[PDB]
């Protein structure tokens, strides 16, 4: 609800905002992309940038200027082909940038789907969860435990057919095991947060299974 | 606009009926799910099974008994993995059915994405088209070029902004190259028939290459 330039922030918990910036498309209105900004002691994790390389700045500038805790890392969970503006600004500002590769820094899973090594220690409290199993490509999702929140990416939406026909004839059961993982990653958290779309319940979840072995 | 047990049938050109049967989500309502009916000579080729078997085998009454076309041949393009019992009945029939692997009749395609072999003459006047480049694993689409018909997944509404996040998250790029290949493929046709979807015009090639583009 609070406005800084281009970018929108929300609070999610004491210590958790989210960022939102908007792209227009003709014909289809503007779309939002979503981020967290995550309070670590005087610092500040950024997940995710935002379109452009000046919305990026923006939510760079705002930790540190109004918030006083500056970022000192970042970590991408849902890079755009052309839209990637943001790696500029994070580059420019000597914040240090993680990635899963599969960004100077890899982030590396342990065969349960949690990181390791130096990267889950440098973005602690964040728990970085990869949810895919074999063969897949999934983006990483990530969570604050303690605080009953998890950011994945987008699912379907309560009454929308739309994306309903492209569901059936992908790989259902291998989406289906990638959302149940990331369920049982969190299985305590009640807003689940979205790449490109506004924070639900669990409601978004099961909803999502429940298609999954209807079709 | 005929309508015979739970298949609805509209003619697309003489010659060529595209049939529709719907699946009701909790929820979510009745979701369409389309293939095609391509009359040849005195026999048809069936164009993807529908939902279920039992929607199946009204199919292919409907073309022994009310087109006197029997169906020779079928070809799948969008498989479902659950609702598979629709291979059941084309079976039973003694229907030879070809599909492309990555069903014991195997369509194989040529570096230029056309099909080959004994498949490409026993599905003729059908031409089957495979999109995708390397790495790729799309479904294959199907084109009538002399009737400007072509058959092919499903594509972004107009207005619709649901899979606009989708679309950025995944391999933009590739997805482009692939509706570009399929445009290329079928440059005449201006009734695009889709998997889950009313037919529409080019418009909706254009317009979800206009996305890609500003993603
Ligand atoms: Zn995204
Ligand atoms: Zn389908």
Redesign the interface.
């Known amino acids: 609800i609070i406005r800084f330039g281009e970018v929108s922030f929300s609070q999610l918990a004491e210590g958790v905002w989210m960022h939102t910036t908007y792209?227009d498309?003709?014909?289809?209105?503007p779309?939002?992309?979503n981020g967290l900004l995550v309070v670590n002691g005087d610092n500040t994790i950024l997940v995710d940038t935002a379109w452009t390389d000046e919305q990026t700045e923006q939510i760079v500038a705002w930790a540190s200027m109004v918030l006083a805790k500056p970022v000192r890392a970042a970590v991408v969970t849902?890079?755009?082909?052309?839209?990637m503006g943001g790696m500029a600004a994070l580059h420019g500002a000597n914040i240090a940038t993680w990635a899963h590769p599969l960004a100077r820094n890899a982030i590396t899973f342990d065969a349960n789907g949690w990181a390791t090594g130096e990267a889950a220690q440098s973005l602690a409290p964040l728990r970085l969860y990869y949810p895919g199993g074999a063969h897949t490509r999934d983006?990483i999702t990530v969570g604050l435990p303690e605080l009953g929140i998890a950011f994945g990416?987008?699912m379907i939406?309560?009454?929308?057919?739309?994306?309903?026909?492209?569901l059936?004839?992908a790989?259902?059961?291998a989406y289906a095991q990638s959302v149940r993982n990331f369920a049982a990653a969190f299985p305590d958290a009640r807003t689940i947060a979205?790449?490109?779309?506004p924070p639900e319940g669990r409601k978004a979840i099961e909803?999502t299974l429940?298609?999954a072995?209807?079709?």
Chains 1, 2 share one sequence.
Not at 25 to 29: A, Q, S
Not at 157 to 166: E, I, T, V
């Open positions: 792209l498309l003709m014909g289809f209105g779309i939002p992309s849902h890079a755009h082909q052309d839209k983006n990416g987008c939406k309560a009454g929308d057919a739309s994306n309903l026909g492209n059936a004839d790989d259902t059961a979205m790449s490109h779309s909803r429940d298609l072995e209807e079709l």
